Amino acid sequence: HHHHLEVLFQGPHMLHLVLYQPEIPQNAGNVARTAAALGWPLHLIRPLGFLLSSPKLKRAGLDYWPHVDLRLHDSFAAFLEALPRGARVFAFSARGEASLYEARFREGDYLLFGPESRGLPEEVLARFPTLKIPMPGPVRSLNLAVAVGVAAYEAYRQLTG
């Protein structure tokens, strides 16, 4: 833990939300809405399954994209190469090795989520510590935007507490 005065001169405290190759624009939009709500960076790792001009990314009566700290990466490789030295990345999977709620999040952690249809590839999962959102019911996975919100807000709870 940092000294109190060091913490003071650090910014509002924040994690990075990262979508690996999102396919469905409504999912990306519903994640962006969460990112802008928290004031946290949203990283989109191409290829995306949609054009950024898609009418499906917004909603009438809503405007959040102008307030999204959007980061675009051309590939997963380029994303990794762009990480600061010592970056901590948590890969989210319903087959994850530890519970989300066991994790102790820190400033500038990266929370990494897969596409709705397939999730993160096994090689990516094997590369990072993996976190599971518990599902006591007979369900294989949650909707992407829901999983991002549950994870992001648990980190928010931890950080602001």
Ligand X SMILES: CSC[C@H]1O[C@@H](n2cnc3c(N)ncnc32)[C@H](O)[C@@H]1O
114 binds, among ligand X, its own copies, none (CB under 5 to 8 A by kind): ligand X
The residue within the footprint of its own copies, chosen from 62, 84, 86, 123 (CB under 8 A), is: 62
Our finding on whether 71 is near ligand X (CB under 6 A) is no
Q: Does residue 26 touch ligand X according to CB under 6 A? A: no
Among the residue ranges 41-49, 104-112, 120-128, 141-149, the one whose residues contact its own copies (CB under 8 A): 141-149
| From the list ligand X, its own copies, none, partner contacted by residue 101 (C-beta under 5 to 8 A by kind) | its own copies
Rule CB under 6 A: is residue 22 a binding residue for ligand X? no
Q: What's the CA angle centered on 107, arms 79 and 96, to 5 degrees?
A: 65
Contact pick of 99, 122, 126, 129 for its own copies (by CB under 8 A): 99
86 binds, among its own copies, ligand X, none (CB under 5 to 8 A by kind): none
53 is an annotated ligand-binding site residue: no
For the chain, give the number of residues.
161
Q: Which of 120, 15, 32 is nearest to 76 (CA)?
A: 120
Figure out which of the listed residues 25, 29, 119, 149 binds ligand X, where binding follows CB under 6 A. Answer: 119
Under rule CB under 6 A, residue 141 binds ligand X? yes
How far apart (Å, rounded) are the C-alpha atoms in residues 132 and 130? 7
